[PDB]
Each structure stands twice: as structure tokens, then as C-alpha cells.
Design a protein around this ligand. Sequence first.
Ligand SMILES: *P([O])(=O)O[C][C]1O[C](N2[C]=NC3=C([N])N=[C]N=C32)[C]2O[B@]3(O[C]12)O[C]([C][N])C1=C(Br)[C]=[C]C(O[C][C][C]N([C])[C]C2=[C][C]=[C][C]=[C]2)=C13
Length: 816
Amino acid sequence: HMQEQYRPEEIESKVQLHWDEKRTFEVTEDESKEKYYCLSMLPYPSGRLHMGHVRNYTIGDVIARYQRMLGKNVLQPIGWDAFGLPAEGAAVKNNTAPAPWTYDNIAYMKNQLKMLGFGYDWSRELATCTPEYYRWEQKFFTELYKKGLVYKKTSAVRKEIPQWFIKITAYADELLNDLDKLDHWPDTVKTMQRNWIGRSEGVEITFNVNDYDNTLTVYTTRPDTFMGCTYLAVAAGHPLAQKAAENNPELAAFIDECRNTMEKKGVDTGFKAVHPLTGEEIPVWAANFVLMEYGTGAVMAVPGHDQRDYEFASKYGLNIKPVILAADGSEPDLSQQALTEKGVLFNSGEFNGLDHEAAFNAIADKLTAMGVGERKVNYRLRDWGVSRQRYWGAPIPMVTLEDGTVMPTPDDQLPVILPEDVVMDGITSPIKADPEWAKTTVNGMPALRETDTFDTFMESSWYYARYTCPQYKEGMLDSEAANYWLPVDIYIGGIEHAIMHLLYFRFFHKLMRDAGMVNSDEPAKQLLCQGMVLADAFYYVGENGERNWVSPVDAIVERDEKGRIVKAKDAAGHELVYTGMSKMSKSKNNGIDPQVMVERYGADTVRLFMMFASPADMTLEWQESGVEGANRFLKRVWKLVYEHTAKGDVAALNVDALTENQKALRRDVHKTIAKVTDDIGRRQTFNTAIAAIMELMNKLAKAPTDGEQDRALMQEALLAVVRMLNPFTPHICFTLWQELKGEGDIDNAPWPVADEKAMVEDSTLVVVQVNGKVRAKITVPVDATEEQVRERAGQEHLVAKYVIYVPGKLLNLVVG
RNA sequence: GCCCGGAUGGUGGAAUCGGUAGACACAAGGGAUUAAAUCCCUCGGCGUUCGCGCUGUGCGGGUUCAAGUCCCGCUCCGGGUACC
Ligand SMILES: *P([O])(=O)O[C][C]1O[C](N2[C]=NC3=C([N])N=[C]N=C32)[C]2O[B@]3(O[C]12)O[C]([C][N])C1=C(Br)[C]=[C]C(O[C][C][C]N([C])[C]C2=[C][C]=[C][C]=[C]2)=C13
């Protein structure tokens, strides 16, 4: 009783309900099956899904459904990165609280994800704003504090705000070195992490300052140039600069100008530091290019060999000394710029003649012996600031006794619950505004608990591991369950997370490994960064000179003979400027609502277009015509199955009794199976895999369907096609598999395997070239020798008119 | 300015660690059909006797029998970034 028309509104919600009733995608830690952990970055509950979520999650679902078909035990989890700033403002504007707003958004977006047919294990679903989740990061933060990895300090955000830090710098070498294990991670992401880590090898040099109580220590990556140091430079916010700023209004003004935010700017402090090797006095200047946060907040200036110092000394008349020769051993030309390149020393006394590595070592060694030097490794990577002065976050489990002592919240008081029934005044966090909230009792003593909450990247740093044991009440992780599934096989997300989430979850993994929780070094094997979804963008210039962005749907376009947009207007008469394909946005007004598209064409059409239009890691250009083309293709697949099943049951296929035509058509079915298998599994080229299925569908629509063996071959092809399309379009394929009388549910059906005997080509095509230009195309047996292929090539008349040989492919003959 | 990318028909894209350039789809133009929609052929440019011939992967070069693919440049494009 198959329907003639393909109507997704009659197929999809029934097929989705079936997946919920049968718990089809719910998995456990089954040791008899090879596991596969396919993860996609968890969504933030903003209210509605965007095309970027649809692309990310379709990619993940294609892999999870295919890996299942190969007989693997697949974990495809989903959850909600539910804490965050956008709930705080939306609660105020909508006269509600961040919690019911978030839970309403989770419920609406969850329905949207189900309407897309993503095969998630919904029993492992998590909301990171529930105490059942954040209680484990609170307990883990108390353990890190006891391990010496957590400290508090006032840092600059400009306001100096006291913050909680986790020492990520204690793991920097490992984060850096373990990038060489990440062969299935993109080079871009790895480069961004190497650069963001910024490992640096140098020397700390300490100086004595005349009429100043403390010493002054600088950090240098070029100690070889120490004899060409003519002055020192400190940050504006540096202690020495602030001491001198009292008897200096010129310096006091500069420090304030710096605080109230590539040109150089500086004021001489008036302090004189003594060069440890010459005993000479050099001035100490306050500089704008020196960061207080990096190293010691002070540098040694060698204007002759550092370009920042060159421009600083040239502007302020400071001394520029040459101490490094140019590559050819000649003295450098410092009249226009600094000599940056590393080389042999001169004007360096006992250090003359030493090459770069020898000069670096000898000067570092000499100073180290004198007590005024020591090698130091610094990192651009700053410690992880994890606290926020915001309400909608997980409470920090730290307390301050009346004693003045600071300690973690005791285990028997965990979790520190964030109250959800609150009224937001927009100005202050309800847990800060109510003075009684922070008043607690710890170790029998009155205490004030932390009112700052964790930043949301704390919950996203370990969610991937919590999906392995989401209802485990005895700890953060069940090591047995975690190690069964971890590391993640493929993590699908965006490159925009390279140096934030993609680095924090690597660090968090190692902390868990070092706590005994996991037995692996890295959280994810392969990282697949999907590209942005693009849409056309138009704007008109208003009478006031303002740009008003118009949605492409609202643009009436005029095209040339070659279909390119030549002129465009809107229904109001405004002349539109087409800007091309760009990132979807609210500023550009060109966003496409995936819910509008799923209701218009069905989830399978939307799913298939996004996998077909472009390679997963490249940008996708949203085109209405391309989505309609995908819709038409699914209707052609439906039509071929409708007509085939309308002819009743089929006979058993006999490969031994096949016609020359019937065998060649079967060979194309099996060669397609092999290509689609390699494109989805090994290459991850879903577009070429869908193209191969479309090419085969074109052939099947031309094949005869009258005759026992024609109908039996068509049965083998339609059962294979429906299974190959299933990861992309699971709802239509679930239904078509039932119409074709396939065994069980297509979700539990095996992935089609190519019959090696069906793909034995008895002959091959040899392109015959003479001087590289193709002149002939011949057909020779696959078992033929080179002599047989050359004799047959010579027999061709056009070849005869006019020696490299590739078996079964090419034969080129250079003209002599 | 720096870093890392990228450049193939009218468009998205294919050609998988050199060997038939443009698969597959969209757009367009013919065909069936009483406008839309769907189905069926044609389709890089130029020339053509309509058979095809010549050329063609941003621009120059190099290795090679052979380069879209590998290497060095120049131009244009894109994302990221801020004296560490
Ligand atoms: P990092 O490690 O990288 O760096 C270091 C350096 O820098 C400086 N500093 C220090 N500290 C500081 C702060 N705080 N801020 C700012 N800055 C700073 C110093 O300087 B040096 O080293 C160090 O020393 C010397 C004298 N000035 C020198 C020279 Br003679 C030369 C050079 C230098 O430095 C530079 C480096 C930077 N960068 C890395 C560069 C580059 C970039 C890109 C490309 C290439 C290169 C110095």
C-alpha cells in the first residue's frame, strides 16, 4: 500500500516517534562491539536553532548513522551549554528569570533537533545548568585547590577585579608537545594553539637601581645582545614607574593615559640602573609597548637589534649601539632600522667572535654565576581566569571564614546550589544583592561564601566525558565507562573555538587523567571543523546616508544572459546593492531559518542539500535552487521505488545467468557501493559520495524493469541505494526500506558491501597518446601484456599516422 | 604590518600523494505538455564543412615523457590577530 507522492509531513514525525519508542540510538558500554564516539559541539539554548547547528549536527549524524551500519557501537550524545550571559539580559527584557527562560529554550530547541531526525542517545542528555551536572566541577575545583593548582589574585579586565585562576601554565609544555600526537587535527587549529601557547626560552637579568630600594629584573630572549643595551623599559603600571611618578607629573600623566584606553610612547623615570657587566649607568624609561602581564613587566633595550627599541630610542634621542655583525661578517647599517638577524658579536669585549648560540650561552652563564641571571621559560598563555561577577553560572565552591582564612566548600556542602527563583534588577546578581545568601557556617565558624560564578567554559571543558556516565552519582566520572568511550573518535565543531574551548578541554582532559579519572592523554582523535553557512546579502542606502540591509527573499533581482545579478530592488522601490555570499547575520539581515526550511521541504531535503553542496570543511553557499534540486532528487528516488514495488514481489537473482547489460549495470551498482564507502568512511567527502549515488540513480531510472532478472537486479540496487542514502536522509530511507521488504529496521541493517566478483572488469580502456596529445582510445583485456597493448595500439590507423606505459590506463609515445 | 589559507565553466563544485579537465548539481537554451511544476536531450571559450579542430585550471617560471595536482616567485581574494 505505498503512497505515490513523497510527503515528508506524512513520514518524518512517525519515523522520529519510532526512534523514541524503540530507543534505537540508546547505547551502553558493550565490550563485544567496536565502539565509535561521534561528538558535535553542544548547543547553547538561545531559543531557536540556526543553520550552523543544522550543518554541524547533520555532519555528525551522517557519521553516527554510517558507523552504526558498519556494526559499530555508536555514542552520539546531545546536551545544553545552558549557563551564560544571554539568559541574564533576556530574563530582564522578558520579566522572568534566567532558569525558566533557559528551560523553555531547551524544550523548544530539543523539539527542533528531533524534527531534524538526529540519532542521539537521549537517555544521556544533559543540561549544564542543573546541580546534577555542575556539582562535579565544583567538587573538581576543590580537589585542584588542594593540589596547588588554584589561586586568587586581582587582575586587570579597565577595572582591577579579584579573580580565581587555575594554573594552566603548569601544563603548557604538555599542551604544546602533545600537538605532535594530533595527526587527525587540522594544521590551522594546531598552529593557532602553538602560537597562543607562545613558549619562550630566555634569560631573566637583574639590575641594581640607584636610589631605589628594590632591584629591577628584565626578561630577554636575546641575552647575546647584552653589551648593546643602552637603557631599560618598564610597563606604565610597574612598581618602579609608580615610585618615580610621585616626584614626576610628566610620568604621572603617562601612567594614567596608559590606564585610560603601533606608536611608541615613553617618559624617563629618572632612575638609573647599573649594567652588571660594565658598571655603567643606563636610564630606566616607562614605555607603552611593555606589558605588565608578561614576564617581569620590564625589558632591556637594544635599539640596534630590536625594532621596537630602535623606534623608541630614535624618537627619544637614546643611544643606539651596534653589537651583532650582518650575515657577511660586516658591521651593520643601523641608519634606517635595527639589525634583527642573529649573528656573530662585536663591541662586546670578552664576548667578541661568539656566534649566536655561543654568545647566548656565555652571557647567560656569566650572569648566572654572578647571581644576577637565570634562564627562564615564559609563555604567552596566561593562567585560566575562571570567575565571573555574574549570576547565571555555577557557584564557585570557595569560602572566607571570619578568621580571614580562605578554604574550599566542604564535601558535605556540595553542591553550592545556585537559586533559580530570583528577581533580576539588571544591576546586581541576586546572590550578591541578598546579603544573607553568602552568609554561611564552615568548620563551625561564620563564613562568607563566593558570590562569583564559574565562566561557562568550565562546564564545556568536560561535558564530552560526562556523556559517558551521565547518571553516575558516586563521582564526576565512572572510569570504566569513560575509558570505554574515550578518546572521542571525531569531534565536529567550528575553528572559531581553536584557542578557547579546543584548548581548555585538552587541559581539562589532562587534569582528569592526572586525577586517575581517565587513562588517555588526549580527549579527541580527529577534530573536524565545518565551514560557515553563507547567504546573499543586499542593502540600500537611505535618504540619510544609512545602509539598510534587505533579506534576499525580499530582493527582486534582474539577471543577465548568463544568470548573474545585474540590478536588484525591493517591493518599496529601493535600489539594492548586492554584496555577494557572506556569513549569515542579523546585521546583514540574511539569516535563513532552518525551521522554515524543514517545514517547507522536510528534514531530509535540508539534510541532503547541506551534505551535498560543499565539502564539510569548506563554506556552504545557501541556495534556494539547490535545496529544490535536492527535493526533486528525493522525489525521483521515491518514484523509482513506487514503480518497482507496484510490480509486486521479485524473483531470486542468478549471477551465473546474467546478460552482458545486466552484469555491467550490476558492476556500476557495486563500484558505487565501494566509492560511497571510501568517500564517507575514509575521505569524509560526503558531497562526492552523494554525487556517486545521484549518478547511479540516473542509470537505474534508464534500466528495463520487465523480466524476472531485471526486477531482481533492481531490487539489489534499490536496497543498496536506500542504505547508502540512509545516513543523509534517514526518514525517507526508513520508509523506502520497508516498501522494499528489507530485513528489520534500516537503522540496524548492514552497510552495503561490494561483491568483489561483481566488479571484475574483463577489459580496460587505454588512452593512447603521441607526444602527450591524446590521439586514440583502445579497449584491451585486463590480463594483456605490454607487447599485446602496443601491437593493438599500432593497429589503430590514427596512431600509425603519427615509450611510457601505465598498465590499463596510458601509453604515451614521444615523436621521433 | 604579521600569521595561516585560497584562486578550475555563468554558479556551487569534481578530478582521492602528477596520467581522458569540468563528475554531480544549479542556472540557461531546445523538446513533450495547457502559466507554474515535473520529466527528456544540449551546454568552458573560439573557429567549424557540424565530422570536429584548436586552445583552456589567476600570472610568470622550474622538475617531468606528462602538472589543476609537486617546488620558488608576482598579483588578486578571504578569515584570524595585535608590541608577549
Ligand atoms: P616573547 O618571549 O616572544 O618576547 C620576549 C622579548 O620581548 C621583549 N619583552 C620582554 N618582556 C616583555 C613585556 N612584558 N612586554 C613586551 N615585550 C617584552 C624582550 O625584548 B627582547 O626579548 C624579549 O630582548 C632584547 C632586547 N630588547 C631583544 C632583541 Br635585541 C631582539 C628581539 C627581541 O624580542 C623580539 C621577540 C618578539 N617576537 C617574538 C618577534 C617576532 C614576531 C614575529 C615574527 C618574528 C619575530 C628582544
